[PDB]
Amino acid sequence: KTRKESYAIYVYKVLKQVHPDTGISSKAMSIMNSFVNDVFERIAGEASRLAHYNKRSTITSREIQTAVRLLLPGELAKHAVSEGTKAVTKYTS
Amino acid sequence: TRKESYAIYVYKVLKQVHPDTGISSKAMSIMNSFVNDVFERIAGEASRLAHYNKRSTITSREIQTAVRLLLPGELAKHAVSEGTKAVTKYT
Amino acid sequence: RAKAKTRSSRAGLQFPVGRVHRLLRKGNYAERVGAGAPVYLAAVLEYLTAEILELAGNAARDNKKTRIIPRHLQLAVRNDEELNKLLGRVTIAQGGVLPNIQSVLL
Amino acid sequence: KKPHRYRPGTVALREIRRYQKSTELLIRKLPFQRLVREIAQDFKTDLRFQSSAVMALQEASEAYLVALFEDTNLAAIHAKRVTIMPKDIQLARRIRGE
Amino acid sequence: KKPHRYRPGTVALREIRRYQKSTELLIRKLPFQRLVREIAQDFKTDLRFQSSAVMALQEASEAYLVALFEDTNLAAIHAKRVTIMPKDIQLARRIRGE
Amino acid sequence: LRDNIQGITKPAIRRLARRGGVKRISGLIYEETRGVLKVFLENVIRDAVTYTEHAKRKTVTAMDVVYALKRQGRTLYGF
Amino acid sequence: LRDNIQGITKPAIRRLARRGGVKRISGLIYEETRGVLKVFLENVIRDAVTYTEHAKRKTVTAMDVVYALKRQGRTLYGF
DNA sequence: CGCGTACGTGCGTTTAAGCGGTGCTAGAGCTGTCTACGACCAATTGAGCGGCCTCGGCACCGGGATTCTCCAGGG
DNA sequence: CCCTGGAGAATCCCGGTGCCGAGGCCGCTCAATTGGTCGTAGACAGCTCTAGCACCGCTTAAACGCACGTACGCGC
């Protein structure tokens, strides 16, 4: 039928990466899919605001970097920045 | 440069219903901030409204639904009647 | 053309970079979306996914459970101080609240 | 012959431990579903709600009421009191801005 | 002679009526300005603040503290008291989610 | 449909407060929270009514319930 | 810059309580209000710091303070 | 209802907030300039997902058990 | 009135079923991937000029501190 967009298998791939001896129910899968989409709307909404606040037309990696510092506080923020920085450098290399 | 502002627009509305009173710059900047803050709230809700029903356009119904979502009580139905009367006076 | 190598494997990631880039363009956020914007967004989403699931697995092994239950996801969020602050105004279905008792209650 | 005669509070603490570690929903579906239709009929008639729509509405209602109940509980012990009061709920709504 | 000797609390409502109808800033500008710099020094050493930037920070903090003091005050009458306590402030932040 | 506010029974409120760690529950608490639940339901459903009427739909979906709760800072996970 | 948390003096906190309708002000509330104000300032300014770095500016403007307060549901009118 | 101490009130006294003034550079707009970048167009392509086969973790049903709690007896 | 021994009932670990939701497999198809091509936002270089940083005089309302007592917090 019609395909619907979801992160059912990507959360599964992340779960098996660090915890290869556990499973997950579909109810918990939908919560994780809800959690990913809600954070996705918050960061992209902040990145959309950040470009409009500086009269900029495009959203770069610094817009995502600035957005996650506003939402994620303190200790949780610096790992997201470090993982974000190491992903960009690996992508460009 | 030129700065977009609603300072003149609030002034004409003020003397429309109360021509015996003035306004200050601090009150005007507060009212300019009030108009801008509601502007992003209604349009942000309307933009989110179009994305929910897979709509690529924003119509008067998008603004109408966002008003009743944001404005509570009889304030929504008063703005709905004012909004409807502007569309009829348009056509 | 060349081999259709996914952008997730190029950045050492599992989350779909192309899918994240697609919803950025069609989500009515900006006129253009940069090249590194979906890469940065996927890395942040992966870390939040991995951190929650790691603590959920720790909560799953606390009560000797293999399957992840939505109580475990709620327990992972509330126990972590950063996850509690980030998701303070977030309601999780089938999660309840923390099983804590006041000191004067006993 | 002598009955057990549990003193008040201990079973209340026991019910706290049994329900805080539980997962299932305390309020039954049918009484909550009929309340939704009665409220919605005052706004728009001939309105239907899906089974998952009532399910989503019921989970959020319990969590909101539980979070209000936790704030009501710590307000009581702040006032050197054990039993919650209706004025404690009115205090919680005003501070929360609701 | 004998001084007027206002009773404890009479001047409190007199200051309540004065500050609730006048919009002057209670906190002095320079002590609040230098506090902002030492807070921002932990995040960026070479940082500057505009005159209106410190102005915008002060009124937001003043209204937040007054609103917190409003939630702090009615918690005392809820606790059969008239004096605010630090446990009332922690009650307000926990209920508000801060 | 009348007198449907009595559907939330007295031990159902007691069970909810047991989840909240409440030690003892007053007899006037049950009547108070029924109005509180009615007020809370009168806002989310009304917001979901506008969501349903905007999509030209006659049945309120669980998607509209989530968006009604999301705009008030009470987002629900798992739908 | 050191010893700046004491800039919010004892009558300054008392004046804020009088605006909020507080009748009696305790002697232990001055340390508590300073900690709450420091915690609140450590979030708004830090959010404004990230807005300043993204704008390629080395000075914090009042416009970024409004944006920092807006995302936390504390939007300020009059800038 | 009673104990009390600690915060309301009053001013002595010090102390910095603020107005006005001076100088200067830290730096945000402003204007060119040149430069990679992403939407869009052909061309193609590869595993996410609907669904089916399989399978296994814990709900259910009891059985048994330690295990923290209440009632009664003794000092 | 407080300390300690025995037992009623809610609660926890465990043996056996199996079952219905979860894990892996079959394609393939629709969204993800590859290459070119420009309009165009953005990084970069030089000017500048209007607002902020630092110090000075004073002066004065704001603030630290001490004496006294009664509204109120806390104990019973």
Numbering used by the authors:
A (entry chain R): 28 to 120
B (entry chain V): 29 to 119
C (entry chain Q): 11 to 116
D (entry chain S), E (entry chain O): 36 to 133
F (entry chain T), G (entry chain P): 22 to 100
Authors' own words:
To understand how these nucleosomal features impact Rpd3S binding to the NCP, we reconstituted an NCP with two extra 20 bp DNA linkers flanking the Widom 601 sequence (187 bp) and an MLA at the lysine-36 position of the H3 histone to mimic a tri-methylated lysine (H3K36MLA). 3D classification of the Rpd3S–NCP187bp/MLA complex results in one overall conformation containing three classes, in which the Rpd3S broadly engages the NCP at the SHL + 2 position with slightly different local positionings. Further local refinement of Rpd3S and NCP density allowed us to obtain high-resolution maps of Rpd3S–NCP187bp/MLA complex with the Rpd3S complex at 2.8–3.1 Å and NCP at 2.6–2.7 Å resolution. We named the 3D classes of Rpd3S–NCP187bp/MLA at the SHL + 2 positions collectively as the H3/H4 deacetylation states of the Rpd3S–NCP complex, and we termed the K9Q-locked class as the H3K9 deacetylation state. Within the H3/H4 deacetylation states, the active site of Rpd3 exhibits positional shifts of approximately 10–15 Å. The Rpd3 active site is ~33 Å away from the H4 N-terminal residue Leu22. A peptide of 9 residues could, in theory, cover this distance, which suggests that Rpd3S is able to target the H4 N-terminal tail from this location. Significantly, within one of the three H3/H4 deacetylation states, designated as class 3, the H4 N-terminal main chain exhibits a distinctive trajectory leading towards the active site of Rpd3, unlike the other two H3/H4 deacetylation states. Notably, weak density from a putatively unmodified histone tail can be observed near the Rpd3 active site in these H3/H4 deacetylation states. This supports the hypothesis that Rpd3S can sample histone tails at the SHL + 2 position for deacetylation in the absence of the H3K9Q substrate mimic.
In Saccharomyces cerevisiae, cryptic transcription at the coding region is prevented by the activity of Sin3 histone deacetylase (HDAC) complex Rpd3S, which is carried by the transcribing RNA polymerase II (RNAPII) to deacetylate and stabilize chromatin. The five-subunit Rpd3S complex contains a unique subunit Rco1, three core subunits (Rpd3, Sin3, and Ume1) that are shared between the 12-subunit Rpd3L complex, and an Eaf3 subunit that is also a component of the NuA4 histone acetyltransferase (HAT). The overall structure of Rpd3S reveals that the Sin3, Rco1A, and Eaf3A subunits form a large continuous scaffold to hold the Rpd3 deacetylase in position. Rpd3S utilizes the conserved Sin3 basic surface to bind to the nucleosomal DNA positions at SHL + 2, SHL + 5, and SHL + 7, under the conditions involving different H3K36me3–CHD interactions and DNA linker interactions.
